Every structure is written in C-alpha cells, then in structure tokens.
C-alpha cells in the first residue's frame, strides 16, 4: 500500500512541477529556464543561466528507497556550502519550482558576490565593503568617509546571472562600460574603482561650490600649458572660475595618497589668466 | 516594398442605411463611427503614353491639421492569384498642403472634384467606408454640391503587402456576414 500510494504521489508531484515550469516558460521567464530532460515519473531537469546569454537543477526519484522524498541535485556547481542557503536549495516540500530555482540561483549569486569581495580584499586588505542579503548586493565604498550613496552598489540579477552596477550621479555610458567590463571579467573592477575615485572627488568639489558665485569646469583650454607649471600638474584637476571677477581661477588637483587607497589629497592653486595665457600660480598652505 | 489594395465594392439605398450601420456596429470593432468628410480631386499627366498617369488627392475638410493624402492606384492585376477582390498596387503618401500647386508644376491638370461624406469602421485589417459621393459644381467652391444618387457606396478595403494570401477569403466571409443587406463583389473597373 505504501509503495503504490507513495510512487503515485511522487510522480504526481513531478507532473505538477513540470506543469509549473511550462507555465513559467510560457508566461514570465521564457528562455531564462529550459527543460533539459523530462521522463514522466522518473526525472525532471532544468537549465538556468544558459550559455546563450550551463547550470542545471535536477529532480530525481530514485528507483530504490521508497522511504525518502524527492531528490534534488545541482549538478554543474555542486554548490559551495553556505549553511542557510544550501539548506533551502535542497527541499521541494513546497511545490513551487520557482522557489527552488530562486534559492539555487540565490546561493550561486551569493558565491559570486563573495568572490568579488575576495577580489577587493585582494587588492585592499582593510576593505569596508558589505554584503547585503535581502537582495544579493555588494556595497563597496570608493572614498573612505562616505554616505549611503556615493557607494558602488553591485547587484546580481538572479534571473540572468549578470552584474549590474549603480552609482548615483554617473552618466549611463560609463555605467554600461563598467557593467560590460565587469561581466566580462571580475579582475577589471580594480582599474575602475581608482577611476571612480577621481570622478567622485570632482562631485565632492562641485557640490561644495554650488552656493558661491563660481563656474566649475574640468577642462580649461588656454595656451602656454607646456611651459607654465599648470602644464606640469596631474590630469585630474578642476578649474573653478570666479565670475564676479574673471581672470581668476582656483585649481584643485587631486592626488592619490600612497598608503590609504580610499582617500584623496587635494592641492589648491591660484591661477590668473589673460588664446588665453596663464600668468601665475601659487599653492595654498595645507593647514 | 510594394503594397497591394484589396477591394470589394457595393451600394446601399439610404432608407435602409441605418440598419447597415447598426449591423456594422455589431460586427466591427468596439468603436463609435467616425463620420469623415473629405474633398477628393483627381489629377492626370498627359504624357507620351496612351495611358495618362493618374493621382488622387484628398483633403480632410472636417479635421483641421490632417495632412493631405496622395494615392496612386495601379492597374488591376489580371492574374487570378486572389480571385475575389480587386487586387491593385497602391502607393499612399502623406503630404503638406501646397500639394496642388506643386502638382501644377509637375504637369498635372485636374479632372474632377467630389466630396465624400460618410462613416468609417474597421475590423482587424479591414476598413469599411460607407459614404455618399457629392458632385461639386462651381468648381472652386466646396459648398455648392449635389448628391450623385440616392444610394450610398460601401467599400471594404485592405491595404497590405504584395501577394500575401488568405486575405481575400476573410473579406469574403465579412462580406457574406452582410449579404442580406449589401451585395459586395469584385466589380471590374471596365464599363
């Protein structure tokens, strides 16, 4: 009696899960999950994170041991053990195939975020990045005293497996370029973060001088530029023209402090200008 | 590419017209009727050929800001590909309002004007237009007009790509849904 009504109930559960996957493919997912194998009453095998834009979750009833319920195998990862997540990725007591897919892909997204955090601590011991787990997200700060914004948020879209980045005031083109380069390979995040220091620095300058009467710019096309010390400065500078009195510029040069990788050092110069020519430069005292 | 126009044509005496309209409001899409009022004028270019070129220009008098419309209608295809509809080549062009003056420079001269006033419905791709043709006398004026006959004209038209079968059969079925009230058929333009 147990063999007959247990075998029938388990194959009924497999039929319910197959019908659910056909609903998900037809309605909302659509080529983000594909049925690899389905033998009725024997096995079901789904494929997520596919090669076109590879991973598999299989559900098998064994032809032995009628004592146990349905068996779940994540055969491409055999995923690394995070104790809460791999627990939830190994039960279909609830008959939701989408919960199983989301929990498996959630555990894989957590592993991918942790290898990103490993890359960042490889470049920088004493990192202060943080993994949030409601959505799978990595918040990495670019300058060390920072708000809740001015932080690179990294998400993994757990229907596709890609990375998605989010800064606040970035242009969309550089965000697309960063997303493409990181989704190509992880180890190119570290050239970008340094580039996101100086950009952020200019934001923190241009918010500063918004109430005073100035005009800020990043490029000043004057002549001389190869004899005047203004040519012999770094390429990350900011020219703040005073508008109540033109011919007067305050030039902020941003430099990397060598030991601290998440701090900047500013240098303020005072240029005057007359085919515009530089005239003089003096540096202000630190403190 | 080159789009083709499929036509079925017929007519309806006016005292039964309302029943037709009510029938169409059942069968056509869930819309109020449109009540178009258009001025149509026909230009021709007397070239070297025995057949002069013909062009139709429509200004929608009722709606302000509607772009003028040019239409070139090719001669009907004698091939029996779609046996049940007038299959012609149609080139339809939205245009600015200096068109007539421009056409006067191209060598075109007018043939006749007529107002057309009626209703407009649709069903999928099909366009049903039920209109009365109004002869203009005093050719500049659009108000001096007289009705051509007592009957309204009914046109069932589908503009769509070259070839493209299983179109005329749906027009046959939609014509047969009206067959007590109207007789729509492929009428040849000769005589």
């Amino acid at each position: 009696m147990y063999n007959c009504l247990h075998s029938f109930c388990l194959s009924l559960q497999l039929e319910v899960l197959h019908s659910q996957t056909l609903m998900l493919i037809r309605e909302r997912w659509g080529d983000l999950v594909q049925v690899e194998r389905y033998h009725a009453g024997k096995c079901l095998s789904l494929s997520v994170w596919n090669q076109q834009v590879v991973h598999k979750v299989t559900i098998k009833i064994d032809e032995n041991d009628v004592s146990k319920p349905l068996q779940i195998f994540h055969d491409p990862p055999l995923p690394a053990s995070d104790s809460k997540l791999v627990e939830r990725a190994m039960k279909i007591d609830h008959l939701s195939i989408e919960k199983l897919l989301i929990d498996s892909v959630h555990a894989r997204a957590h592993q991918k975020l942790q290898e990103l955090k490993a890359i960042l601590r490889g470049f920088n011991a004493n990192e202060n990045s943080s993994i949030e787990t409601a959505l799978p997200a990595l918040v990495v700060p670019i300058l060390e005293p920072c708000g809740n914004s001015e932080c690179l948020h990294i998400f993994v879209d757990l229907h596709s497996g890609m990375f998605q980045l989010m800064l606040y005031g970035l242009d969309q083109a550089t965000l697309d370029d960063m997303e493409k380069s990181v989704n190509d390979d992880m180890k190119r995040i570290i050239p970008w973060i340094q580039q996101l220091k100086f950009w952020l620095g200019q934001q923190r300058c241009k918010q500063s001088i918004k109430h005073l009467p100035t005009i800020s710019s990043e490029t000043l096309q004057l002549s001389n530029y190869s004899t005047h010390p203004i040519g012999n400065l770094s390429k990350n500078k900011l020219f703040i023209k005073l508008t109540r009195l033109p011919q007067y510029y305050i030039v902020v040069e941003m430099l990397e402090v060598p030991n601290k990788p998440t701090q900047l050092s500013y240098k303020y110069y005072f240029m005057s200008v007359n085919p515009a020519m530089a005239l003089l430069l003096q540096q202000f005292k630190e403190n | 590419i080159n789009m083709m126009e499929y036509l079925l044509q017929g007519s309806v005496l006016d005292h039964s017209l309302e029943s037709l309209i009510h029938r169409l409001r059942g069968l056509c899409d869930n819309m109020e009727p449109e009540t178009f009022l258009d001025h149509e004028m026909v230009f021709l270019l007397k070239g070297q050929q025995a057949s002069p070129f013909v062009l139709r220009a429509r200004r929608s008098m009722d709606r302000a800001g509607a772009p003028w419309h040019l239409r070139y209608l090719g001669q009907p295809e004698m091939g029996d590909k779609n046996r049940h509809a007038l299959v012609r080549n149609c080139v339809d062009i939205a245009t600015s309002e200096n068109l007539t003056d421009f056409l006067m420079e191209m060598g075109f001269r007018m043939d006749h004007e007529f107002v057309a006033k009626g209703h407009l419905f649709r069903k999928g791709i099909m366009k049903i237009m039920v209109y009365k043709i109004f002869r203009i006398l005093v050719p500049g004026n659009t108000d001096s007009t007289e009705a051509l006959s007592l009957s309204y004209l009914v046109e069932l038209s589908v503009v769509a790509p070259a070839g493209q079968d299983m179109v005329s059969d749906d027009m046959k079925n939609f014509a047969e849904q009206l067959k007590p009230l109207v007789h729509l058929e492929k009428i040849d333009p000769k005589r």
């Binding site: - | 080159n2 070239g47 062009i93 245009t95 421009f102």
Partner: protein
C-alpha cells in the same frame, strides 16, 4: 524648425578635404561640442524644368521635393516609390546623386554638422550647417549664429542666406534648410574642378 545656416567651407588651399574636416571637428571638440551621431543628406535631380528629391537624416521619415524656385513638398518616404512608379515621365538623371556625410555635434542648443560633399567617389568640398534650436524666426537670432560662426569658423564666415532675406516675421520652416542645401549643391556642381 529651428533657424539654420548652411555654408561652404573652402578647400584651405592645401591638404585633403579630410584634413580640413579634422581641423573643424577638432575646433568643435575644443569648444565643448559632443558627438551625438552621424548625418547624411541625399539629393538627386529629376527631369522630364528640374525637380530635386532630398533626404535628411534629421527628418528620417520625410522626403523633400524641391522645385528650384517653385514650392517645396514634404512627404513621407513612399514618395521615392512614386518616382520609381513614374519612371517614364520623370527620368532619374544619373551622375547627379550627391551626398554629405559627417558627424553632428551638439553644443548647448547649437547643432553643427560638418560634412564632405561626395559626388560619386570623389569628395569635392565641405558643407557646414549650424542650426539654432530655440529661435523659430529667421533674421532675429541671426547675430547669435554670427557670433558662433565667428567663434569657430573665424574667417570664411558666411552671411545672411536669401531665405532669411524675405524680411518679415516669417516663421522659419524645414523647407528652407533644404533650399539652402540645394543651392550649396548646385554651387558645388558648378564649382566641379
């Protein structure tokens, strides 16, 4: 329908057309203009009186029919098909297709399009078009266009196309730009060399 001005940049008396185009686009990249795509302008002449058919990139659904002193038609793209349907009354008059190709720079409601006029294979001149978006009335914002053209053209700065010269409060239209392009193309065809 913003006020535009079309002009011929001369040869420079030396180098290639491409190098002078590099010079002008370099000056534009100095002033703070940003590339926002490319642009193409096509003109063909049809004859039985001459008629012109022109296409802009900016108005991609429209084709302009220019009767040299007569009225302009604007129509949708199917007008081209009608010329192929005409085909006996209006011959195509080949070896007069003319194009300009280039990049379009935007600098704070100014659109600068610098193209290389290419009759067939050989590029035979530089077209420069500056459109000022906000103004809609010709000859009122003309001094603005003059200062911008004096900023980056410097010398060879054009002055006051005759479409402006109808001196009223007449609203500028998109036909006037294609009129200016047709005049420029006729000047380049007669320039030839």
């Amino acid at each position: 329908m913003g006020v535009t001005c079309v002009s011929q940049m001369p040869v420079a008396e030396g180098k290639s057309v491409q190098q002078t185009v590099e010079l002008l686009t370099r000056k534009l990249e100095m002033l703070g203009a940003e590339k926002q795509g490319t642009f193409c302008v096509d003109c063909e002449t049809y004859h039985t009186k001459l008629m012109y058919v022109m296409h802009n990139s900016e108005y991609p659904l429209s084709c302009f029919a220019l009767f040299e002193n007569g009225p302009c038609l604007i129509a949708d793209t199917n007008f081209d098909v009608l010329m192929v349907k005409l085909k006996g009354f209006f011959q195509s008059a080949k070896a007069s297709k003319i194009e300009t190709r280039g990049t379009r720079y935007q600098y704070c409601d100014f659109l600068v399009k610098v193209g290389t006029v290419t009759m067939g294979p050989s590029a035979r001149g530089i077209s420069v078009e500056v459109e000022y978006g906000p103004c809609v009335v010709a000859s009122d914002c003309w001094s603005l266009l003059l200062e911008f053209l004096q900023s980056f053209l410097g010398s060879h700065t054009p002055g006051a196309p005759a479409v402006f010269g109808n001196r009223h409060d007449a609203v500028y239209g998109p036909a006037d730009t294609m009129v200016q392009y047709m005049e420029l193309f006729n000047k380049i065809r007669k320039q030839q060399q």
